[PDB]
Amino acid sequence: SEVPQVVSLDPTSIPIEYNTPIHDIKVQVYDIKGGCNVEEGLTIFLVNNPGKENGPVKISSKVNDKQVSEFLKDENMEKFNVKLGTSKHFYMFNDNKNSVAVGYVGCGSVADLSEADMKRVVLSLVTMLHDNKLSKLTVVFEINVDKNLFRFFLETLFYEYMTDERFKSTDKNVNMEYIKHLGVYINNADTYKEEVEKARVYYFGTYYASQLIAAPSNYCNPVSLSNAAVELAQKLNLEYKILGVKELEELKMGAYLSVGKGSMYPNKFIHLTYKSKGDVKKKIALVGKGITFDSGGYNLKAAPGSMIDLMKFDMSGCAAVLGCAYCVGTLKPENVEIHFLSAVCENMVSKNSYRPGDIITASNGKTIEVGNTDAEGRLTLADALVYAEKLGVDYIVDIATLTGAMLYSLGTSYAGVFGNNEELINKILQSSKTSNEPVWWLPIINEYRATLNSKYADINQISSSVKASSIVASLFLKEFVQNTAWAHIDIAGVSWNFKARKPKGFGVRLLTEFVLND
Amino acid sequence: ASEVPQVVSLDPTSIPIEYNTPIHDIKVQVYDIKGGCNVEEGLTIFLVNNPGKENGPVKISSKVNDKQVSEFLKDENMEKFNVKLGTSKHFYMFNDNKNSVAVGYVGCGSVADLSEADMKRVVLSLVTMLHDNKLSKLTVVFEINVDKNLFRFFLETLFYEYMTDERFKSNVNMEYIKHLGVYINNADTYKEEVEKARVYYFGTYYASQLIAAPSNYCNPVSLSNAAVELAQKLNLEYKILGVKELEELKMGAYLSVGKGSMYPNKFIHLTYKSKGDVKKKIALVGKGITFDSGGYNLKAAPGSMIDLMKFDMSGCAAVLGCAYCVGTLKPENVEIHFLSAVCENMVSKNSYRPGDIITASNGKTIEVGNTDAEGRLTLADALVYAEKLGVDYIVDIATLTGAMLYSLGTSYAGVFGNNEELINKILQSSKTSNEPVWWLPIINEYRATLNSKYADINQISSSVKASSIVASLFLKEFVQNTAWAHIDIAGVSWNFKARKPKGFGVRLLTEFVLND
Amino acid sequence: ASEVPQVVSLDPTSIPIEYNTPIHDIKVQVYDIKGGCNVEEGLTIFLVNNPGKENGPVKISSKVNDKQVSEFLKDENMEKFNVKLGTSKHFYMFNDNKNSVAVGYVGCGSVADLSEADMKRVVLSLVTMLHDNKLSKLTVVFEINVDKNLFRFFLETLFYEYMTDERFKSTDKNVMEYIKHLGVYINNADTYKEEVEKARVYYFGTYYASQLIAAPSNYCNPVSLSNAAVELAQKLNLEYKILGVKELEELKMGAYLSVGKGSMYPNKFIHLTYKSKGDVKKKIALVGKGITFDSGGYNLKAAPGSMIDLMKFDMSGCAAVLGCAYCVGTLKPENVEIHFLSAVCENMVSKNSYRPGDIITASNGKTIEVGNTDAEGRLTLADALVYAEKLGVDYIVDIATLTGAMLYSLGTSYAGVFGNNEELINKILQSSKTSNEPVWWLPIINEYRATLNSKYADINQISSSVKASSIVASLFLKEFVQNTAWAHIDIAGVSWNFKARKPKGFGVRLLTEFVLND
Ligand SMILES: CC(C)C[C@H](NC(=O)[C@@H](O)[C@H](N)Cc1ccccc1)C(=O)O
Ligand SMILES: CC(C)C[C@H](NC(=O)[C@@H](O)[C@H](N)Cc1ccccc1)C(=O)O
Ligand SMILES: CC(C)C[C@H](NC(=O)[C@@H](O)[C@H](N)Cc1ccccc1)C(=O)O
Ligand SMILES: [Mg+2]
Ligand SMILES: [Mg+2]
Ligand SMILES: [Mg+2]
Ligand SMILES: [Zn+2]
Ligand SMILES: [Zn+2]
Ligand SMILES: [Zn+2]
Structure with a gap:
């Protein structure tokens, strides 16, 4: 609070x-x-x-x-x-x-x-x-x-x-x-x-x-962003709960918690729920990456082109999910229950930060070797996905400013969607069409999975050899969904309107049409 | 032979x-x-x-x-x-x-x-x-x-x-x-x-x-000699166009690239024709840069892999490999043209420069922003040549953009195109050949970045980092009214772990020709 | 046990x-x-x-x-x-x-x-x-x-x-x-x-x-690594003392303390002793560089090739010295007393860290101008070497992952040895031969000494002109041994088996053969 x-x-x-x-x-x-x-x-x-x-x-x-x-x-x-x-x-x-x-x-x-x-x-x-x-x-x-x-x-x-x-x-x-x-x-x-x-x-x-x-990032930090989410939920009459550090520790969310270690703001996990009156026919978890500032951590964003000054936008995923909560809460669709989730934290440099090489344990018991503190989004998403799957939903959709490589693959107009289930991907593509927020389906290439084999931990956070980083990040996330239809929308390239110097609010209408169509 | x-x-x-x-x-x-x-x-x-x-x-x-x-x-x-x-x-x-x-x-x-x-x-x-x-x-x-x-x-x-x-x-x-x-x-x-x-x-x-x-063994002249010898062994029709014929055809984009080289440009044109009625004509076009130094935009940046650039004729090699298969298997009812504008991209007193405005064989003027974007210049004129043949499909294959490594990586090639049916035929060939390909979009919103202040078109974008998509937008300007697809094999062509080529694309193209 | x-x-x-x-x-x-x-x-x-x-x-x-x-x-x-x-x-x-x-x-x-x-x-x-x-x-x-x-x-x-x-x-x-x-x-x-x-x-x-x-580095930090050393001494019946910050301040170990200022883990100086039950004929101190994570400090390892992700390995000298303690304590050589020392700390970025330019005072009273916070190993070793010479030993041998330049000079197979005493260097070379852990003798070139002259302090930590960084490091360390045969083993190139993605535990057998054959 x-x-x-x-x-x-x-x-x-x-x-x-x-x-x-x-x-x-x-x-x-x-x-x-x-x-x-x-x-x-x-x-x-x-x-x-x-x-x-x-x-x-x-x-x-x-x-x-x-x-x-x-x-x-x-x-x-x-x-x-x-x-x-x-x-x-x-x-x-x-x-x-x-x-x-x-x-x-x-x-x-x-x-x-x-x-x-x-x-x-x-x-x-x-x-x-x-x-x-x-x-x-x-x-x-x-x-x-x-x-x-x-x-x-x-x-x-x-x-x-x-x-x-x-x-x-x-x-x-x-x-x-x-x-x-x-x-x-x-x-x-x-x-x-x-x-x-x-x-x-x-x-x-x-x-x-x-x-x-x-x-x-000085206004919008894990505490103020989760407080804003509570105020939203109160205004729309959504059920809400914010999980603090002690609850996160109890849930063994070691990947998410390691990311936020070096921050002055405690981790806050947002969980809002809309539930229709009547028969609930589909249950959906929407998960938004919510890094309120991404410095890179000890792998500091210092290389030319790393855009550290733009990194207040690294909670765009969480913002899309909260925008979606506003629309769903306002329009009140029938037959659904929707969980709006974000593991919120800030990735900072401190005596208290996680380090390159650290081995951490995710809430599903998998150990992860950290190869780069700047691949923090996938760690927070990992624990959020585990939390989502425990809710017993039909679909998990995550949205995230995950990889800079999106700028080189799709650029600034189209988001990438990856997933483990073709019918879910098609629903998202359908929603892309009726929302007019463009998305293109990209592959999860299993041949690259072996590059995430760690010598010591169960899995590596990053590839040693594969430069296809958006695909590698999707391979890593896939390890945290066991048996649920899941899709992942990488909005790194589309979220910020570089020419107009402002956000697009990309994904709110996409995700809402997804919920409404279903 | 020359x-x-x-x-x-x-x-x-x-x-x-x-x-x-x-x-x-x-x-x-x-x-x-x-x-x-x-x-x-x-x-x-x-x-x-x-x-x-x-x-x-x-x-x-x-x-x-x-x-x-x-x-x-x-x-x-x-x-x-x-x-x-x-x-x-x-x-x-x-x-x-x-x-x-x-x-x-x-x-x-x-x-x-x-x-x-x-x-x-x-x-x-x-x-x-x-x-x-x-x-x-x-x-x-x-x-x-x-x-x-x-x-x-x-x-x-x-x-x-x-x-x-x-x-x-x-x-x-x-x-x-x-x-x-x-x-x-x-x-x-x-x-x-x-x-x-x-x-x-x-x-x-x-x-x-x-x-x-x-590249000291395989240069524009010895590579086109090799294609003639292959054509002779298979009984394919063949023609090698040299510099004077290429000037007559006004291939300014392609000729500009090879200006810096001691080896004269050679355009390879082999043809397979079925003995029975021709129901389908296809042009296969391969990028044929026998060494890509970058030119004046020299490959000197970390990770530019100049030591690997003998592989920049991989698209040409895939087309010639396909011509062996087609010439051997002898499909019915088809006529296939195997094309490559072959040259070498070098640094010399004679080389083209960043900034040059050159004129392609369809009359379009192109402002060169980067001499290391040479592949699309040679393909522009090869595409105009292909379309003039009056074919049903044009498929190009090229080691075109380093960005492929960051989008699809080393396993799947990307395909772009102006025709959904043709793209689906490529995807189907990919499935049966087991050479994986993924469809990527030609995003028209990026087309304005190719508007030159001076020439009809820019070779490259100043702003857009989605370079594989921009390259495709550029090449699309050289196909006016034919189904066309472009396969970018930059990421997939060389097996880095094993230190050797894949020969990527031969089976893909052959399946395309045989099953369509 | 802290x-x-x-x-x-x-x-x-x-x-x-x-x-x-x-x-x-x-x-x-x-x-x-x-x-x-x-x-x-x-x-x-x-x-x-x-x-x-x-x-x-x-x-x-x-x-x-x-x-x-x-x-x-x-x-x-x-x-x-x-x-x-x-x-x-x-x-x-x-x-x-x-x-x-x-x-x-x-x-x-x-x-x-x-x-x-x-x-x-x-x-x-x-x-x-x-x-x-x-x-x-x-x-x-x-x-x-x-x-x-x-x-x-x-x-x-x-x-x-x-x-x-x-x-x-x-x-x-x-x-x-x-x-x-x-x-x-x-x-x-x-x-x-x-x-x-x-x-x-x-x-x-x-x-x-x-x-x-x-x-x-999250598991092996200066507190947990000194606790492991305590446990090992208890198992082998070696004497032990762990010096904490209050005792280190009392000993005026300003160089070592400065390196650790940025860490959330207090410095811990490890001192184990093996003494033979008979008449002692030789006294030996073995000093290992003990940096549990080297971020570089404010001179952050951000440069391409700086390998920040491998820097848990910067306590490899300390590990070799403790592995040696294990062998010595087990085999129990006669007529010898051996001191196993490591000035253990973590090199981090913090409001509290030491800065490029800081002037700090070592325990022998020499003032040192800090030129690069990433040359932290030689500062910790300076103080560990002063402590070691005070013990009154016949030989001091330190072993350290000290300079990246070793990869350009001897590479990944041979360690380099430098020293102030040819009889002692020949003993190390003989140990190398009988342990089958290869080492090559490299010179301490006095001509470079002058480039360590500081305009303000008694000495510069680093050279501004000389790129031969391993020899420069050796010159700097030499200033902290006044009157005792000393040798320095730089294992930066040899410690980590890059191909197999694991340590070699390099130095253990070398140092043990050194002790045994003396
Ligand atoms: C270390 C890498 C493998 C992963 C790394 N990912 C990130 O930095 C994410 O945490 C970034 N927030 C993604 C990003 C980078 C640049 C522009 C927009 C968005 C990236 O560089 O893309
Ligand atoms: C300037 C850019 C738009 C295009 C430029 N293209 C090229 O350099 C091509 O001529 C290269 N032959 C493509 C390439 C680069 C690296 C590895 C494999 C293949 C590139 O750097 O990708
Ligand atoms: C500032 C320089 C004179 C000294 C600097 N030394 C260090 O960074 C040590 O603290 C490093 N532990 C040296 C190192 C780097 C890479 C691989 C193995 C070992 C180095 O770059 O070697
Ligand atoms: Mg990051
Ligand atoms: Mg080039
Ligand atoms: Mg250092
Ligand atoms: Zn991020
Ligand atoms: Zn090229
Ligand atoms: Zn170090």
Whole structure:
């Protein structure tokens, strides 16, 4: 419970914003066949031109205003093109003689937008919202989108529009004002209406994970992160328990505890549970790596390219799992019981730290020879997986910023999924599709298992000879699931948006769609 | 033949090649295990497992036709030994006729389905005995369960691992066997795999010979000479394009790479055509860099492995190895073009430079960001050449990106492509050849990193570290409207532990051509 | 016996040590070859060579007391096999009593005197025949010439390589049975019999050192390692004193204390004494470097190739000295008093650690400017050498994993010896010859002395200019011995068997032969 401090100025909680400005936006959806009213604020058309690379803009909607309809005639629009992510603003007086702003974002010439294309559209729309004090946005869909992509549009709009100012003090943006109303016109509106508040929920799970990830290691440490998790559980009425060191010692969690030895913050293992009222048909454990700062330990992140300054993000797994708890707790699916687990700790340099070469004993009795203190995530996950399997679940899914090698294999757009069960992997791939968080299935190559044979311990933490480190880490984790369907999502390459200098909150919507689909 | 230039008169002017190998003299017989075993002669090895009982005892069930060997094989003696994968024992003894025989076993663990990796460990253990034996016959008794493809793989791997390459040396511990007996259940169905294995073995071994051949022996001229000689022996159509023809074709990307080399570029084009109607045309394109120094981007960083870079023509060797198999097995209804833009990547006053803008044969200008990304430059022009042939499929195979070691490692190659059906055919070939491959994505979001400020395209990304995916995006720019796949064998081509090539890809490509 | 401090309750509080090993249960019988060999149960291996003829044929020359086995081993049958060094074959047949027997040979090549390295190769071949074969007995027939020392070395090596250290195995023990009996046939057997128990003692001292070296730094820390030394003294009836920090401060051991400042484990200085019951004619101090983990300190081992993961091995000098104590205490030489010393500590990174640049005062009052916290071994040895000279001994010999440069100079096979006294160096070289643990004499080059001149302190810990780091270390140590014959053995290159992934226990037999032959 109490966060230790070195000096009185050290923070004792993570600041967390629950009621965000996005939550105050009144959203209305209307059917496009009634025509568009253009009365105030900004009205943006989403337009493409199938076939025609950089083709002309042609506004097809009925617009219920003579002045605006006149402005938007093909002749007047012909100067402009649909190049993806392109946009323009128009200014005019409507029939009520009130000035309005109108514009468009180009959605290109391929009639089915990828998740990345749609994100490009949303970013252009967001630049129209920034540096312009507007009370209302209206979006007219003149493109084709399924229900999941419409929801993705809104989630992405909400998340990209929201600006995280929790750590601003003298430099808050004096000009940021958020719209209070969002109008949407789309064909077959009634079927899209359900997606609006689901988007709002998914936006918040994602933005909540993001807040946790962006919070630096002096704010977000094992104690404050587990305290935040308790507060979340209380707000959603989830069952919760936080296991402290004495309980962890009783459970013989020697791999997890060795990692956190050198830290000033005691280890805290988070265990939240959602249980549907009614028959429980699937039981699922979701396990998130929760290293609140990864210095590397005695194998210090000192090599060029090791990104030590980014390592507050090494609890992104735990944050995805807590974001997922927010969504599941809010949407209340039937027929399931979900355990949201994270072994939280910090990997530090101290007289008290574990050392390279140390032999430690995991909670399932396996001895492990530590070959590199910087492979700490798999040690904490090892004990968390053992704990998960004891719960008697149908599926165990872990999510973790586990290996830097992901940047060289899949890069920054797709997460890797590994697993011991093809049906579970397919469920995750399915969830990747409907969440629009991209994942690619990678193999657990058993030929490399022999490189984890230790001369002294039961197993080596790291390979001597294999450089395929994401596969080797999956081989190691596999040793801590005995007989349960298990998949492991490595988000090391996708978690942080290096270009925008912010978290993605990657995996919240993926894991939630996984729970919901099941 | 073109003459190979020499700096001194001691410089070699051809690659030595062994066509006739001791493996070719092995008479192979397959017998049904249901009849019991004849152990009267030579070295007999039982392949044995113990399901469930991990590292459990050896127990041999087969009846054998010798009372002395029966005694040796009794449960009480055999239980002194265990089945741990690759563990072996063998003993010399006298049979009923007082003739020297030897008898032993290789442990096959306690899992009934052996993977190709597992089967490799079994074979290595068998080969260790063979490299220290001298008896005229080996008999292998399968008391384990393998499918037809895995049985073929066993044979191929046995032949390949048993054969030792002594071309560059100037045992009194062994002699090559003249006979191989195999006892296995349903022997009749397995018999047809034998000569197929012997063909796949030599395709693989031939590729290996070319890869292991050092870069003073195997240069663009001697390698293309070797391909002409292979084509002649197989009756394939062949054409070697030299520098003047290559300039006429405007192959600026490929020619730029070889500018620094004393050896003129040579583009190998062999063709197999079926005697009956052609229903399918395929181009197989192999990366053919006979030595990759890196160029001005010299391989000087720790772990860059410049000492290994004679292996950078592994894709070319795999294609030529495939041409041996195809030219030998003679598939019907197919026309296959075997292609390689061969050159050497060197440091010279004459070399291309980082920064150069060069023009590929399809008109695209390319800004060179790194002279050690030379493979994709030579493949760009080879791909444009392939597409102009009007084929149904283009498959390229190349030691293209060091990043493979960090994504899939040393066991599985990666495949990328623009066509799902073709990728699935490659995956299926991978399953039947037992040369493992994994599908990796061409991620279009990374394509913008290849937008050059000056040229039509960048050779490399400044930002994206997913270099195998970026390389594939680059190559995809050189295939306009044909099903195409790219196999990156950088991680998988060289066997680091054994200090020798794998010949990776021969069987994969041959299976592709034969079964599709 | 001090309490081992723990960070968590799962931290181990002692080093596990096996004293009664399966090798100790083996009954050894030596027979003279003139009586013929009896060939019965187990496995009977002939060691055969063929002088002149590289890879020449096997010919078995011993009389075998069995007609069937004699027929089997006749020249005609054996000539199809060759003597290539390390090569081996197994034979199966029925003896004259109709009982199946296993026989075989190991090739010993064509050179009539085997080097220590060649013999190791023969033994490794023999061990592979023992492994994965449930045998009650092994019989070895020598048809090669070995002197008494080489015979003993054969047995020591056999025992050492055969013994498998499973102390840290839990779930992965080798489901491994040992022979109960070892028969040896050799010419002039009566003359070799005395080597058998000597070999068995030397095996254990070596294996004991090996157990200490392989024990990871969480098990083997300065408190637990000094407790193990106490236990060993109690078992052997050696005197002992363990000096703790209060006594070390009183003795002004500032160099040694500074190295340990960063550790959570208090320094412990080990002092064991063996004294012969008769008139003492020689007094000897053996000093071993005792760093239980070397992180480098603030000069962290982060450089590629710094092998931080192997640094549990930095107490290998101390282990060799304690292995020597075992042998000496067991064999009980006369007319000698031996002091076994080690300044044990751990070199860590902490708010409390010593710093690059710190100036510290050794117990002989010399001030030392610290140039690199990773040159910590010579600082601990400085103080241990001052203590040792105060004892009033005739010879001081230290042994230490002191400099990585040994790998570039002598490599992994030979240790280097440096000293201030040629008579003593020659004694060490003679011990090397009779122990078969190779050492080469290296110079202390006075010309480099000047590069240890400190602008501020009395001396520099390290050279800024000279890259010959092993010689520089020796020069520095020389300054802490005023008037006594001293030698220094640098075992950094030789201690760890990199290929086999285990210690050699190097130095035990060398130091024991030194003591015995004096
Ligand atoms: C020691 C290695 C085998 C494993 C090591 N893994 C780690 O450091 C993880 O604990 C890192 N948190 C993973 C990471 C590294 C760089 C960027 C993003 C994420 C890695 O270097 O990838
Ligand atoms: C600059 C990069 C995008 C590409 C570069 N590619 C190359 O060097 C190729 O020409 C190499 N032939 C690929 C290679 C590297 C290391 C081991 C085996 C194979 C590489 O370093 O992987
Ligand atoms: C700073 C240098 C002059 C001295 C430094 N010495 C050390 O690090 C010792 O404390 C090390 N124990 C030496 C070592 C390194 C690698 C393998 C075996 C032994 C060394 O690098 O050898
Ligand atoms: Mg790490
Ligand atoms: Mg290159
Ligand atoms: Mg050091
Ligand atoms: Zn981490
Ligand atoms: Zn290359
Ligand atoms: Zn040291």
